[PDB]
């Protein structure tokens, strides 16, 4: 078990990347197709 720890790290890192993209699937989920653009909300305020 000389360089054993590396293998554990290598699995968790990959899982981190997956969950990282998963959270980037939520926070950058813009959902452009509305009648409320941010510029359009700023115009509706005026």
């Amino acid at each position: 078990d000389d360089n054993s720890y590396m293998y554990i790290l290598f699995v968790m890192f990959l899982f981190a990347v997956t969950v990282g993209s998963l959270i980037l699937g939520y926070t950058r989920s813009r959902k452009v197709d509305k009648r409320s653009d941010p510029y359009h909300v700023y115009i509706k305020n005026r």
Partner: protein
């Protein structure tokens, strides 16, 4: 801001012509026929279904002021023009000819007036044997 949107309210009132608050297709067709353009009914409908967001078929005043507020200097609107020039780019190097551009602008699509093409050419860098770099010509009309 307010002296801008007052002028946009005046321009909206030029289209409205009553107290309805909406621009129908007939109220736009009468303006375009007073200018002498003779639009088709499908063209008048396509010009309104690009603008409105409620989907009812007319243009309200926040919908009218929204399209007049945002600048053409964007990422999508610049790249679409940069791609539209690449259709008329022989050899793909990023340069088009002067006579080729004058032939394209006065024949294809909307026939642009030759007096207007003479103005269009001299704004862009024409020196170098007739070649013109169209990317500066896109920077001229999108950033300004």
């Amino acid at each position: 801001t307010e002296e801008q949107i007052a002028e946009f309210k005046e321009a909206f009132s030029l289209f409205d012509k009553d107290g309805d608050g909406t621009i129908t297709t007939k109220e736009l067709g009468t303006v375009m026929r007073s200018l002498g353009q003779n639009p088709t009914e499908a063209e008048l409908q396509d010009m309104i279904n690009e603008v409105d967001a409620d989907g009812n078929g007319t243009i309200d005043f926040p919908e009218f002021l929204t399209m007049m507020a945002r600048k053409m200097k964007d990422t999508d609107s610049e790249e679409e023009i940069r791609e539209a020039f690449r259709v008329f780019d022989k050899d793909g190097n990023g340069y088009i000819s002067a006579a080729e551009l004058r032939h394209v602008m006065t024949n294809l699509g909307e026939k642009l007036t030759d007096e207007e093409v003479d103005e269009m050419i001299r704004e862009a860098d024409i020196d170098g044997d007739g070649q013109v770099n169209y990317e500066e010509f896109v920077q001229m009309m999108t950033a300004k």
